[PDB]
Design an enzyme around this catalytic site. Sequence first.
Site, PDB file in Angstrom:
ATOM      1  N   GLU A   1      -0.972  -0.837  -4.313  1.00 42.06           N
ATOM      2  CA  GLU A   1      -2.070  -1.787  -4.168  1.00 42.06           C
ATOM      3  C   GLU A   1      -3.385  -1.209  -4.682  1.00 42.06           C
ATOM      4  O   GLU A   1      -3.387  -0.255  -5.459  1.00 42.06           O
ATOM      5  CB  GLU A   1      -2.213  -2.214  -2.707  1.00 42.06           C
ATOM      6  CG  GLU A   1      -0.972  -2.883  -2.139  1.00 42.06           C
ATOM      7  CD  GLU A   1      -1.083  -3.166  -0.656  1.00 42.06           C
ATOM      8  OE1 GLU A   1      -2.114  -2.801  -0.054  1.00 42.06           O
ATOM      9  OE2 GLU A   1      -0.137  -3.754  -0.089  1.00 42.06           O
TER      10      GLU A   1
ATOM     11  N   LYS B   1      -9.015  -2.109 -11.900  1.00 40.15           N
ATOM     12  CA  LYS B   1      -9.715  -3.137 -11.139  1.00 40.15           C
ATOM     13  C   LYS B   1      -8.733  -3.858 -10.225  1.00 40.15           C
ATOM     14  O   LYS B   1      -8.129  -4.858 -10.611  1.00 40.15           O
ATOM     15  CB  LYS B   1     -10.409  -4.136 -12.068  1.00 40.15           C
ATOM     16  CG  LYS B   1     -11.251  -5.169 -11.330  1.00 40.15           C
ATOM     17  CD  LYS B   1     -11.880  -6.173 -12.280  1.00 40.15           C
ATOM     18  CE  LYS B   1     -12.729  -7.182 -11.522  1.00 40.15           C
ATOM     19  NZ  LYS B   1     -13.345  -8.193 -12.425  1.00 40.15           N
TER      20      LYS B   1
ATOM     21  N   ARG C   1       6.288 -14.205   2.192  1.00 36.57           N
ATOM     22  CA  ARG C   1       5.833 -12.878   2.593  1.00 36.57           C
ATOM     23  C   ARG C   1       5.700 -12.800   4.109  1.00 36.57           C
ATOM     24  O   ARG C   1       5.429 -13.805   4.769  1.00 36.57           O
ATOM     25  CB  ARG C   1       4.493 -12.550   1.931  1.00 36.57           C
ATOM     26  CG  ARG C   1       4.498 -12.696   0.419  1.00 36.57           C
ATOM     27  CD  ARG C   1       5.493 -11.745  -0.225  1.00 36.57           C
ATOM     28  NE  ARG C   1       5.101 -10.350  -0.053  1.00 36.57           N
ATOM     29  CZ  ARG C   1       4.369  -9.668  -0.927  1.00 36.57           C
ATOM     30  NH1 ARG C   1       3.949 -10.253  -2.040  1.00 36.57           N
ATOM     31  NH2 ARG C   1       4.058  -8.402  -0.691  1.00 36.57           N
TER      32      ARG C   1
END
Length: 285
Positions: free
Chosen positions: A2, A57, A276
């Site tokens: 992540e 980013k 999820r």
Amino acid sequence: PEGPEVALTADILEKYFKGKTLEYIDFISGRYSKSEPEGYDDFIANLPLKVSNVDTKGKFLWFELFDPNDKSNKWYIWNTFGLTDMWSLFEAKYTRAVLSFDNELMAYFSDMRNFGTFKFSNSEKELKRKLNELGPDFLKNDDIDISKIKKYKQPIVALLMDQKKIGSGLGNYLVAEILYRAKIDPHKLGSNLTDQEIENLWYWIKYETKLAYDSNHIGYMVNLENESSKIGRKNYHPNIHPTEKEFDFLVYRKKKDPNGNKVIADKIIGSGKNKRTTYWAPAIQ
DNA sequence: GTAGACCTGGACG
DNA sequence: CGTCCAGTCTAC
């Protein structure tokens, strides 16, 4: 990986491969062993090139290579991350990409589930738009107005998993930890949040992203655990200082929180086969 | 909103 | 073996 994970990977790649000349790159296995990525043949035809910068980013990493002989027409190696994406200095298992730098310097990219993507482009204009498809970096950017959450009539957990609306970087376990720290029900709409809840949310966003960034071993950068400890951390969110020396899972993938409260494996986000699991505690959130 | 797929496992009964 | 669980795109 992540936000904090990918960002840390860039710092490591910057340490060992910035200023180094990449002579060749080989995909020995996976999806890119069957079909070449976009702009591959043109990229190889321009090798060798010299790596100038490795910046990120959120969940998007890219290399910036150039030629000492010609400074212009610099190339970019795009790399989006899946669930089991890891960079390494050695050929680990599931090694999908091999980067051959000068003086036998080797770089390896591993991916089990083969969900990570590679893209080569000599256009800077295409890269700028790609970054504009992503929201602000929750870890690297300290001036993010998250008051835009109030405009959305959608679950807060879905807005944070989003990479364009409010910001980029947050993933599945991060939003579970953040919503727990801020004591916010993941089902609660962003348009129902209070001005105090917003200000309190932004704090824990900075708290969890920095804590996950300063950590050395979470379980998604196993191929760089030894390198994460041999490198410093960029001073992201200077005014925020976590008390923990390591990122511990408070509610993610656990039966109970450290206090003993019940944790629900709830399916709020997704449908069909892309559902999820959002872990949270009703007695706290 | 809801459905599927991309791919390769680990953990558990 | 069998069953759950583990970033992002597409289509009705």
